[PDB]
Design a protein around this motif. Structure first.
Motif, PDB file in Angstrom:
ATOM      1  N   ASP A 105     -16.132  42.532  31.475  1.00 45.39           N
ATOM      2  CA  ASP A 105     -15.340  43.227  30.472  1.00 45.39           C
ATOM      3  C   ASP A 105     -14.098  43.791  31.139  1.00 45.39           C
ATOM      4  O   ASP A 105     -14.188  44.408  32.204  1.00 45.39           O
ATOM      5  N   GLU A 106     -12.935  43.577  30.521  1.00 43.85           N
ATOM      6  CA  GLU A 106     -11.660  43.918  31.147  1.00 43.85           C
ATOM      7  C   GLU A 106     -11.546  43.196  32.492  1.00 43.85           C
ATOM      8  O   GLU A 106     -11.526  43.807  33.558  1.00 43.85           O
ATOM      9  N   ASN A 107     -11.502  41.863  32.404  1.00 48.21           N
ATOM     10  CA  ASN A 107     -11.946  40.997  33.491  1.00 48.21           C
ATOM     11  C   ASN A 107     -11.223  41.274  34.802  1.00 48.21           C
ATOM     12  O   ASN A 107     -10.026  41.023  34.949  1.00 48.21           O
ATOM     13  N   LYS A 108     -11.975  41.786  35.768  1.00 47.29           N
ATOM     14  CA  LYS A 108     -11.441  42.138  37.071  1.00 47.29           C
ATOM     15  C   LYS A 108     -12.461  41.771  38.133  1.00 47.29           C
ATOM     16  O   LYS A 108     -13.657  41.683  37.862  1.00 47.29           O
ATOM     17  N   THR A 109     -11.973  41.518  39.336  1.00 50.27           N
ATOM     18  CA  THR A 109     -12.808  41.296  40.502  1.00 50.27           C
ATOM     19  C   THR A 109     -12.439  42.322  41.561  1.00 50.27           C
ATOM     20  O   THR A 109     -11.257  42.526  41.848  1.00 50.27           O
ATOM     21  N   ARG A 110     -13.448  42.977  42.120  1.00 49.13           N
ATOM     22  CA  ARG A 110     -13.267  43.850  43.265  1.00 49.13           C
ATOM     23  C   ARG A 110     -13.452  43.031  44.534  1.00 49.13           C
ATOM     24  O   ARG A 110     -14.434  42.287  44.666  1.00 49.13           O
ATOM     25  N   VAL A 111     -12.504  43.173  45.457  1.00 50.48           N
ATOM     26  CA  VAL A 111     -12.463  42.400  46.687  1.00 50.48           C
ATOM     27  C   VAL A 111     -12.175  43.333  47.853  1.00 50.48           C
ATOM     28  O   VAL A 111     -11.602  44.413  47.689  1.00 50.48           O
ATOM     29  N   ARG A 112     -12.600  42.911  49.035  1.00 51.40           N
ATOM     30  CA  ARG A 112     -12.285  43.572  50.289  1.00 51.40           C
ATOM     31  C   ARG A 112     -11.249  42.741  51.028  1.00 51.40           C
ATOM     32  O   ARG A 112     -11.445  41.536  51.228  1.00 51.40           O
ATOM     33  N   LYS A 163     -10.200  48.146  49.588  1.00 49.78           N
ATOM     34  CA  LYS A 163     -10.805  47.589  48.388  1.00 49.78           C
ATOM     35  C   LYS A 163      -9.731  47.465  47.319  1.00 49.78           C
ATOM     36  O   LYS A 163      -8.983  48.414  47.073  1.00 49.78           O
ATOM     37  N   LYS A 164      -9.652  46.298  46.693  1.00 51.00           N
ATOM     38  CA  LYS A 164      -8.621  46.019  45.708  1.00 51.00           C
ATOM     39  C   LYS A 164      -9.255  45.440  44.456  1.00 51.00           C
ATOM     40  O   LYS A 164     -10.205  44.660  44.532  1.00 51.00           O
ATOM     41  N   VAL A 165      -8.717  45.820  43.304  1.00 46.02           N
ATOM     42  CA  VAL A 165      -9.145  45.293  42.017  1.00 46.02           C
ATOM     43  C   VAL A 165      -8.071  44.329  41.536  1.00 46.02           C
ATOM     44  O   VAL A 165      -6.919  44.724  41.326  1.00 46.02           O
ATOM     45  N   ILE A 166      -8.453  43.070  41.350  1.00 43.81           N
ATOM     46  CA  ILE A 166      -7.532  41.996  41.012  1.00 43.81           C
ATOM     47  C   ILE A 166      -7.992  41.378  39.703  1.00 43.81           C
ATOM     48  O   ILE A 166      -9.159  41.486  39.331  1.00 43.81           O
ATOM     49  N   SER A 167      -7.066  40.758  38.984  1.00 44.90           N
ATOM     50  CA  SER A 167      -7.449  40.009  37.797  1.00 44.90           C
ATOM     51  C   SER A 167      -8.395  38.877  38.172  1.00 44.90           C
ATOM     52  O   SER A 167      -8.212  38.203  39.187  1.00 44.90           O
TER      53      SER A 167
END
Ligand SMILES: [K+]
Ligand SMILES: [K+]
Ligand SMILES: [K+]
Ligand SMILES: [K+]
Ligand SMILES: [Mg+2]
Ligand SMILES: [Mg+2]
Ligand SMILES: [Mg+2]
Ligand SMILES: [Mg+2]
Ligand SMILES: [Mg+2]
Ligand SMILES: [Mg+2]
Ligand SMILES: [Mg+2]
Ligand SMILES: [Mg+2]
Ligand SMILES: [Mg+2]
Ligand SMILES: [Mg+2]
Ligand SMILES: [Mg+2]
Ligand SMILES: [Mg+2]
Ligand SMILES: [Mg+2]
Ligand SMILES: [Mg+2]
Ligand SMILES: [Mg+2]
Ligand SMILES: [Mg+2]
Ligand SMILES: [Mg+2]
Ligand SMILES: [Mg+2]
Ligand SMILES: [Mg+2]
Ligand SMILES: [Mg+2]
Ligand SMILES: [Mg+2]
Ligand SMILES: [Mg+2]
Ligand SMILES: [Mg+2]
Ligand SMILES: [Mg+2]
Ligand SMILES: [Mg+2]
Ligand SMILES: [Mg+2]
Ligand SMILES: [Mg+2]
Ligand SMILES: [Mg+2]
Ligand SMILES: [Mg+2]
Ligand SMILES: [Mg+2]
Ligand SMILES: [Mg+2]
Ligand SMILES: [Mg+2]
Ligand SMILES: [Mg+2]
Ligand SMILES: [Mg+2]
Ligand SMILES: [Mg+2]
Ligand SMILES: [Mg+2]
Ligand SMILES: [Mg+2]
Ligand SMILES: [Mg+2]
Ligand SMILES: [Mg+2]
Ligand SMILES: [Mg+2]
Ligand SMILES: [Mg+2]
Ligand SMILES: [Mg+2]
Ligand SMILES: [Mg+2]
Ligand SMILES: [Mg+2]
Ligand SMILES: [Mg+2]
Ligand SMILES: [Mg+2]
Ligand SMILES: [Mg+2]
Ligand SMILES: [Mg+2]
Ligand SMILES: [Mg+2]
Ligand SMILES: [Mg+2]
Ligand SMILES: [Mg+2]
Ligand SMILES: [Mg+2]
Ligand SMILES: [Mg+2]
Ligand SMILES: [Mg+2]
Ligand SMILES: [Mg+2]
Ligand SMILES: [Mg+2]
Ligand SMILES: [Mg+2]
Ligand SMILES: [Mg+2]
Ligand SMILES: [Mg+2]
Ligand SMILES: [Mg+2]
Ligand SMILES: [Mg+2]
Ligand SMILES: [Mg+2]
Ligand SMILES: [Mg+2]
Ligand SMILES: [Mg+2]
Ligand SMILES: [Mg+2]
Ligand SMILES: [Mg+2]
Ligand SMILES: [Mg+2]
Ligand SMILES: [Mg+2]
Ligand SMILES: [Mg+2]
Ligand SMILES: [Mg+2]
Ligand SMILES: [Mg+2]
Ligand SMILES: [Mg+2]
Ligand SMILES: [Mg+2]
Ligand SMILES: [Mg+2]
Ligand SMILES: [Mg+2]
Ligand SMILES: [Mg+2]
Ligand SMILES: [Mg+2]
Ligand SMILES: [Mg+2]
Ligand SMILES: [Mg+2]
Ligand SMILES: [Mg+2]
Ligand SMILES: [Mg+2]
Ligand SMILES: [Mg+2]
Ligand SMILES: [Mg+2]
Ligand SMILES: [Mg+2]
Ligand SMILES: [Mg+2]
Ligand SMILES: [Mg+2]
Ligand SMILES: [Mg+2]
Ligand SMILES: [Mg+2]
Ligand SMILES: [Mg+2]
Ligand SMILES: [Mg+2]
Ligand SMILES: [Mg+2]
Ligand SMILES: [Mg+2]
Ligand SMILES: [Mg+2]
Ligand SMILES: [Mg+2]
Ligand SMILES: [Mg+2]
Ligand SMILES: [Mg+2]
Ligand SMILES: [Mg+2]
Ligand SMILES: [Zn+2]
Ligand SMILES: [Zn+2]
Lengths: 84, 50, 252, 109
Positions: free
Chosen positions: C141-148, C154-158
């Motif tokens: 939901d509210e499509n995001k991926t958390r990445v290192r 830590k970054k939240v990207i589409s």
RNA sequence: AAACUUUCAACAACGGAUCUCUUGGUUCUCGCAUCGAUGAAGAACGCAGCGAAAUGCGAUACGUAAUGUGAAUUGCAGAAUUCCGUGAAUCAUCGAAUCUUUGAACGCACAUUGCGCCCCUUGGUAUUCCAGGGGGCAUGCCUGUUUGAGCGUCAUUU
RNA sequence: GCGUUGGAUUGUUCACCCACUAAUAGGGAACGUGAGCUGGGUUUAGACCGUCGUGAGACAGGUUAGUUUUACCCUACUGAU
RNA sequence: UUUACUUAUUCAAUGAAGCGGAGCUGGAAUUCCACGUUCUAGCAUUCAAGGUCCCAUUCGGGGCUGAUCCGGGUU
RNA sequence: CUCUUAAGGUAGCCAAAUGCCUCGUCAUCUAAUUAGUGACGCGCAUGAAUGGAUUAACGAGAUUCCCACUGUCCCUAUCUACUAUCUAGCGAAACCACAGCCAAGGGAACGGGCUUGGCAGAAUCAGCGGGGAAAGAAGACCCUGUUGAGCUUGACUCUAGU
RNA sequence: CGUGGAGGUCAGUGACGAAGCCUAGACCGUAAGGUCGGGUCGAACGGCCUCUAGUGCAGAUCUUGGUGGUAGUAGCAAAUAUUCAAAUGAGAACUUUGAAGACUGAAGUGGGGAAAGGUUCCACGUCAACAGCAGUUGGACGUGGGUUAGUCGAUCCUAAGAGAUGGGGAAGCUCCGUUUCAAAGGCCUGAUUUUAUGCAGGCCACCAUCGAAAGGGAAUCCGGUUAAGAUUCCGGAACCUGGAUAUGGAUUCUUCACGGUAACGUAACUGAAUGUGGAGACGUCGGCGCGAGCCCUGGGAGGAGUUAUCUUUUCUUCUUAACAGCUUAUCACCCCGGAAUUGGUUUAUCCGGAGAUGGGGUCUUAUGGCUGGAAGAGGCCAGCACCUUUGCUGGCUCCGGUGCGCUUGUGACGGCCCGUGAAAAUCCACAGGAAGGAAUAGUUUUCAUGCCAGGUCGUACUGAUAACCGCAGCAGGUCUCCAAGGUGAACAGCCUCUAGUUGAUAGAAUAAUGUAGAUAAGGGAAGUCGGCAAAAUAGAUCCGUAACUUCGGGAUAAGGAUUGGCUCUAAGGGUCGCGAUCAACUUAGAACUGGUACGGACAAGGGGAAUCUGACUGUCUAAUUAAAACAUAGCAUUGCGAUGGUCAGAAAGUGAUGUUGACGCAAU
RNA sequence: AUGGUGAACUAUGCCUGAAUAGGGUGAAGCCAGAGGAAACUCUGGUGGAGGCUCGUAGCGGUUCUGACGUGCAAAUCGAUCGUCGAAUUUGGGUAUAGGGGCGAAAGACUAAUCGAACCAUCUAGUAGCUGGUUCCUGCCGAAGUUUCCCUCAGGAUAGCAG
RNA sequence: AUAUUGGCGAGAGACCGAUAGCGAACAAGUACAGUGAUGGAAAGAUGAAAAGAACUUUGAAAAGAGAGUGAAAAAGUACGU
């Protein structure tokens, strides 16, 4: 160095002849005449350079057309012929 | 340079043609303040600076 | 009284990058319909060296879906990618090293590289040799991926941002001592005019904040405020701390 | 010994100013400027030099017949024989496998 | 005693003061209003029987035409003296022309006498290639003309 | 009147010691003497240290590197016509 | 203060190419899911053949479909 | 145990390119050493990336000793070339109040001139570096100026940026 | 009192001489000054009353100009060096010719160029000035002559970069930006041929232009010729591009060729859009192979030199262009075959069941050979004629060898990188199959031959101890190509050949002091701040080599010995079928020999024990400091995840890092 | 201060070219052999590495504190020296322009100019400071003291003088 | 009606008189210097008229000595004083 030995390396021209004024003030790399400002539309001149203005101003050439303008005005810009 | 621009060669041609002494019949004209060629140039004395 | 070196760098006269020998900007494919909905298969033609870049580049040829022609792309080669390998780019591509997948299409713990910060920027993150991004989670939901990121951030990207499965090739590069001023010279000859570096304390006061004095010394704290102005930001800018780092990273 | 001079105004030993010392029918040594050597045309698949293809500077190929620039095969003076053969085999086998995949898909549904 | 030194005079030097000159400058006053895309100012290169310049001019080149005057120009040479004449002259005047290469500078360039495109025409078989001659091709803006674009939009067939 | 030295250390004056000696006296001459030298020191600009100074910088503190120009005139002197 | 709306504004990409909403077909319960490419360094272009309708003839030409429809909001 | 303002110089290192006193003291090197080296260390004022200690190799870096070597010296001598020198030709410059012998005196307190003495004879050549407080440059040290400039800093007053 | 100018006046002076200037001649005034005579000179000027000022000079390191003493003085001394004779001339150290002696010594004092200069090039005349003496000579002076291109350059391409347009910013001069938020387009042709265009079928674009006389790049060579031009002229012989074209050939009745198993071959042997590929197109170093030119060398055919003696001897000529045909490689590849007893093989250890070795083939044409070009040219000779242009007449221009040789090109390799070492124009090929295509005939200007044209600008010369810059004819500076013999490791030093030069003002003497070069008894740093300067050492072969060390070095450590000449000895190779034949140096040893000399000149480390300091290589105060300073690798800290860090800009729809992304960028 | 001109020198980056004898040492990789029960040591070759080294051309400039120092020369000459195959040298093209650049950092370099280039103008800038200040004669004839001053080399004020 | 150190045409001055007056009375914004912006001179006078010295002689010549021209050569283009 920096004196006589350095003066021996001077064989590359910073300026060449200007097409507009012919002064050898056309900077080759800047492609701009340091004297008349070519290729700028206006002719370079400065009010602090009164002597330079006097050097290059109207009347220092032959005034191929302006020299006759005054006589033409005196005759009133007539257009016909003298008609014997 | 022996590979010169035509503009340079034209200037050298003019300089060569005007590298001459005063014509001798001048100095015979009626008033004639002119004594000698005061604009004479020589390659060993004053460079043309193009 | 004089403009200091870090100030002079911004004019970009002699401090521009030496880009003559470079292969071209390393970018993913333009995000198109094929990658948004299915996949497209390209072929790795060459794995080449890029001047000024530690990582090798992969020239990958795809067919143009709309015109009969080939389109060559310059990817940053992931380690294990070989010439003649088929690369699959798109939402439906498989989870194989070298493939380009949207971040939302890969499971947690996936290692990706050349990750887009935004969908369609064609790669911004984890591009240097040996670096990679780790997928640590999804928010569908509210499509995001958390990445290192390589820095540990830590970054939240589409979730539509893309990345290449695997790690950038050429890793371990900085483990070898340069051993020589000449080797540093040749390294930076192909990057930019940032070497060698004169110490500010070795200059005069006119040249640098650190210059001058009857001894070489900074004179005032080398930690400089974030709000300082150009010509003042020499030393440790906005330093939270100084000294030999003793303790742990990844602050909570 | 006789010493030679450059015959052009280029006085520098550049790639385009290479000379060879030749003896003329006048019995004297003279420099002769030599063109840069030609590179063999190379296979577009493997990069090896193409057999049977004349090796000339690029514009010289406009002055020679088709026979010097080609080989009588499916890719002539573009791809070498082994690369062409690999193309034949790959095309045939992959097309056959495409047929097999299609029928396997149809019979698995 | 000479030489030498110094002083003075005469004559001679050196030098260019003084004096006298003055087609120049300077300042004041009066009158006038007229640069340029119809290509200016400025530049380059050229042009004379014999000129390097200044001055003049532009391949029609110290000039052509026109008008007036009425016999020169002049350093030499040459020409003419019919010079009672539509006629000398480095004359005056100046309304017709020419006006190279440029230059705001305008086909594109220009450290190049570099490179195009269009029209008419001539020659080489020659619509296509090459060459010669003539005429063209800048930008902004205005009015208008023509050809267009936009489901911006009206009506109409539907 | 006559002589009053050779050296180790120090740029050194000074000092100190070794040694010879008849003796190793003290001084002046623009603290004689740099167009006589030399330039180790001092005494510009380079650099290092310590102390001081927030700093630029300071130090009759230490250290290292750092262009010594001209006589052909007059006199004096030496010789020479 | 947190949040929504989009047309101002802002960012970015592309030769503004497939966006949004429906629908056909199959599966399964009005809803859901599916709905042309993955052994291989080959090839992939000529309004695409095919199907269909019309004309006009010896050359062929045109439309529709192949390739769903709608909204013209490039994303 | 305290107190100055937090701590109170740890490992090391040293009269060290850092030590005033100082040519420190001890040892060694020498005939003799303000030098060198090794030690010592309440170290005016050594000391830990203002990096401490050490280090093979490297150094036109600074320093001490030794062997070789030598005119560096004892202590000077001699030879060659080119000068200088003389001539033909050619032909400058610096500098110049006027000039050019001293002693003393006084004097702006160190005279070429003045005073008193000594003296004093044309015209000169090569050298010379005593003097001309010789030349070169409106002292660069120092002070003054209500003269600057480079640079610095919570000086005064502002300012780009943020 | 005096000066320039102004109003008035003396009807002032003056070509029968105004003014000015000179005058140990006269007079007046205390003086500033005034007056007169004499000389010189040539056109104006003065007294008085007043007016007016740019009105009075010894100075200001005053300004401009001129001139002295210094002073015929300092000096005209670096780059080895000049000499004899003749000719010319008024005049000769310096010009020209001859002779001789020297030098540069191929990293040139030679032969060309780039930048720069601009006529200096060359001829004739010619010496007032200039060439720091001279001058008859000259880069001077005067007058003329001279630079010939389809092929060499420019021109064209793009490089770093520069820069319009569309837009945006700026009060504005203008700034940004270079494909961007743009309606940015010419070229194919159905059809049209009321006109191959407008209407109209249908194919391609993310963009001006400038930017290289060393990068890329279509194509030319030889011989001869001028006072001075030559890849440009002349003669001959080629080649490329653009165009036009008609034959011959080829191709087609199986329409767009055949042959080979294949690698591929060829005289050709349709091919639009579109796509793809190649060439252009790439670092450096090392050894190895091959080629070219040069060097060395044998025989012979000529010419010359030496010849008391010796020397089948010393020197010299014997050459072959672009282009064309045939042919010729390493590498690479193909067919056969199936490999351990693993083999092949490089100087360098790589390769082979992913097919080695081997046998047989294919290919690229760097390159070489033969032939054409082309002997007719050029070279070297001889015999002739000769008042000229000068002409002939003949002969010979041949055959080998050698190599760690030099220079250079090239090939196959190998080493190196946290360095992997341009771009574009342009040319070709392939895929594709649009289209056009034959039988009293169609198809093909990638096969051969034939025809026409190739514009513009540059082109001379120097390129430096005299043509450039440095005030100059300046011992400075200024990019590059070629490159003989000996000694020797050698592009070192020394000598020589070709070529060039013999130019630096000279003559005479030989004092001091100098500058540069040397030597020295005995001592040996006692000199001095300090061994500054100098000396000593030095090549090669053999022996021997310490502390310490990061194990790599230190190291040529230190410390010893030997070296000539001559006569010998031994070993080290190729090719052909153990023998035959051919061939070049390197090494080792021995005897003999001498005033014990011998790297005989040249050339060429002094070494050791320690301390301070900087790790090292590297860098800087051009023109007083080269260091311990700076840099450096290594170490550490700092900021920053792009709506960002750091830094530009007046501003921007603007920039650098950034063709970037934490193994990164930025700041210490 | 305002507006302009310079990167022909030099500094640095970029682009495109070019240049660099002969020796010493002898790294990886490779081949053969020896010893050893083995592990593994050891030896001989080969090869040709290195911001290695001796030393040309080159680039630089240590010492003589040599020459010269009115020079050959506003930086040279000689000898001696550092370096000499990569952080190397260098041509040409190109970029960076004055409170700006560029700097392996010396306040170095930016055309003999640098602790702020050059050119012109503002500008005859201001100067309590230095220098000079042009005819004669006649008569009179000083002051260096008072008070105030960001004053102490100046001025105002009173005094002295005409 | 006002301004006008530019342009064109005029009239003037108790102005300057060739180191003055514009930088420039003259082939002056010239020659020349600087890469460049820019900087930027010096330089008027025979005589009324060239009548600018025929001719002779010495000298290689430049020139000299005569002669001559001219009012003057004590005006000889190196020219008024
Ligand atoms: K500091
Ligand atoms: K072929
Ligand atoms: K300053
Ligand atoms: K050298
Ligand atoms: Mg300078
Ligand atoms: Mg330039
Ligand atoms: Mg860039
Ligand atoms: Mg660093
Ligand atoms: Mg540093
Ligand atoms: Mg410093
Ligand atoms: Mg500061
Ligand atoms: Mg600070
Ligand atoms: Mg310091
Ligand atoms: Mg072939
Ligand atoms: Mg015109
Ligand atoms: Mg004294
Ligand atoms: Mg003295
Ligand atoms: Mg002295
Ligand atoms: Mg003294
Ligand atoms: Mg000293
Ligand atoms: Mg100092
Ligand atoms: Mg402190
Ligand atoms: Mg302690
Ligand atoms: Mg201590
Ligand atoms: Mg000690
Ligand atoms: Mg001692
Ligand atoms: Mg600490
Ligand atoms: Mg400390
Ligand atoms: Mg070094
Ligand atoms: Mg006396
Ligand atoms: Mg006294
Ligand atoms: Mg005196
Ligand atoms: Mg007396
Ligand atoms: Mg006397
Ligand atoms: Mg003397
Ligand atoms: Mg004296
Ligand atoms: Mg003073
Ligand atoms: Mg002073
Ligand atoms: Mg005061
Ligand atoms: Mg101030
Ligand atoms: Mg007056
Ligand atoms: Mg008179
Ligand atoms: Mg007199
Ligand atoms: Mg008169
Ligand atoms: Mg006056
Ligand atoms: Mg005077
Ligand atoms: Mg006076
Ligand atoms: Mg004076
Ligand atoms: Mg004077
Ligand atoms: Mg003399
Ligand atoms: Mg001399
Ligand atoms: Mg000599
Ligand atoms: Mg001779
Ligand atoms: Mg010699
Ligand atoms: Mg010789
Ligand atoms: Mg000549
Ligand atoms: Mg002379
Ligand atoms: Mg003479
Ligand atoms: Mg003669
Ligand atoms: Mg001449
Ligand atoms: Mg060409
Ligand atoms: Mg622009
Ligand atoms: Mg171009
Ligand atoms: Mg070229
Ligand atoms: Mg010639
Ligand atoms: Mg010909
Ligand atoms: Mg055939
Ligand atoms: Mg085989
Ligand atoms: Mg070479
Ligand atoms: Mg020539
Ligand atoms: Mg030449
Ligand atoms: Mg030469
Ligand atoms: Mg010159
Ligand atoms: Mg030899
Ligand atoms: Mg002795
Ligand atoms: Mg002895
Ligand atoms: Mg001894
Ligand atoms: Mg001693
Ligand atoms: Mg002593
Ligand atoms: Mg001592
Ligand atoms: Mg020495
Ligand atoms: Mg030894
Ligand atoms: Mg040792
Ligand atoms: Mg060092
Ligand atoms: Mg210096
Ligand atoms: Mg030095
Ligand atoms: Mg350091
Ligand atoms: Mg430059
Ligand atoms: Mg070395
Ligand atoms: Mg020197
Ligand atoms: Mg000296
Ligand atoms: Mg001297
Ligand atoms: Mg300093
Ligand atoms: Mg004044
Ligand atoms: Mg009185
Ligand atoms: Mg005073
Ligand atoms: Mg004047
Ligand atoms: Mg006068
Ligand atoms: Mg200048
Ligand atoms: Mg006169
Ligand atoms: Mg008279
Ligand atoms: Zn101009
Ligand atoms: Zn292939």
């Amino acid at each position: 160095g920096k004196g006589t030995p350095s003066f021996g390396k001077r064989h590359n021209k910073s300026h060449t002849l200007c097409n507009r004024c012919g002064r050898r003030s056309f900077h080759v790399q800047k492609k701009t005449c340091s004297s008349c400002g070519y290729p700028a539309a206006k002719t370079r001149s400065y009010n602090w350079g009164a002597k330079a203005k006097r050097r290059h101003t109207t009347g220092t050439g032959r005034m191929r057309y302006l020299k006759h303008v005054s006589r033409r005005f005196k005759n009133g810009f007539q257009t016909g012929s003298a008609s014997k | 340079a022996a590979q010169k621009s035509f503009r340079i060669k034209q200037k050298m041609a003019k300089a060569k043609k005007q590298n001459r002494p005063l014509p001798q019949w001048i100095r015979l004209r009626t008033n004639n303040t002119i004594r000698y060629n005061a604009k004479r140039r020589n390659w060993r004395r004053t460079k043309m600076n193009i | 009284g004089r403009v200091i070196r870090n100030q002079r760098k911004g004019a970009g006269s002699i401090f521009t990058s030496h880009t003559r020998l470079r292969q071209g900007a390393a970018k993913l494919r333009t995000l198109d319909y094929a990658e948004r909905h299915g996949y497209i298969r390209g072929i790795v033609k060459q794995i080449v060296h890029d001047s000024g870049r530690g990582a090798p580049l992969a020239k990958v040829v795809f067919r143009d879906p709309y015109k009969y022609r080939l389109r060559e792309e310059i990817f940053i080669a992931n380690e294990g990618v070989h010439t003649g390998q088929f690369i699959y780019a798109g939402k439906k591509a498989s989870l194989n090293v070298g493939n380009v997948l949207p971040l939302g299409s890969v499971p947690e713990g996936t290692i990706v590289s050349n990750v887009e910060e935004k969908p369609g920027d064609r790669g911004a993150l984890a591009r240097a040799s040996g670096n990679y991004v780790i997928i640590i989670g999804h928010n569908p939901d509210e499509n995001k991926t958390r990445v290192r990121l390589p820095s540990g951030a830590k970054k939240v990207i589409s979730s539509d941002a893309r990345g290449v499965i695997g790690v950038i090739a050429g890793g371990g590069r900085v483990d070898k001592p340069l051993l020589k001023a000449g080797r540093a010279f040749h390294k930076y000859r192909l990057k930019r005019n940032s070497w060698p570096k004169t110490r500010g304390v070795a200059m005069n006061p006119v040249d640098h904040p650190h210059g001058g004095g009857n001894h070489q010394h900074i004179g005032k704290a080398s930690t400089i405020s974030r709000g300082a102005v150009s010509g003042q930001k020499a030393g440790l800018i906005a330093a939270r701390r100084t000294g030999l780092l003793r303790g742990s990273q990844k602050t909570q | 010994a006789q010493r030679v001079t450059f015959r052009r105004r280029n006085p520098y030993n550049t790639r385009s100013n290479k000379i060879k010392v030749v003896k003329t029918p006048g019995g004297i040594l003279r420099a002769q400027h030599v063109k840069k050597l030609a590179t063999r045309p190379k296979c577009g698949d493997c990069g090896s030099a193409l057999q049977g293809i004349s090796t000339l500077r690029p514009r010289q190929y406009a002055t020679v017949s088709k026979t010097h620039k080609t080989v009588s095969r499916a890719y002539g003076g573009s791809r070498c024989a082994n690369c062409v053969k690999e193309r034949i085999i790959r095309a045939f086998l992959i097309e056959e496998q495409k047929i097999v995949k299609k029928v396997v898909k149809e019979q698995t549904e």
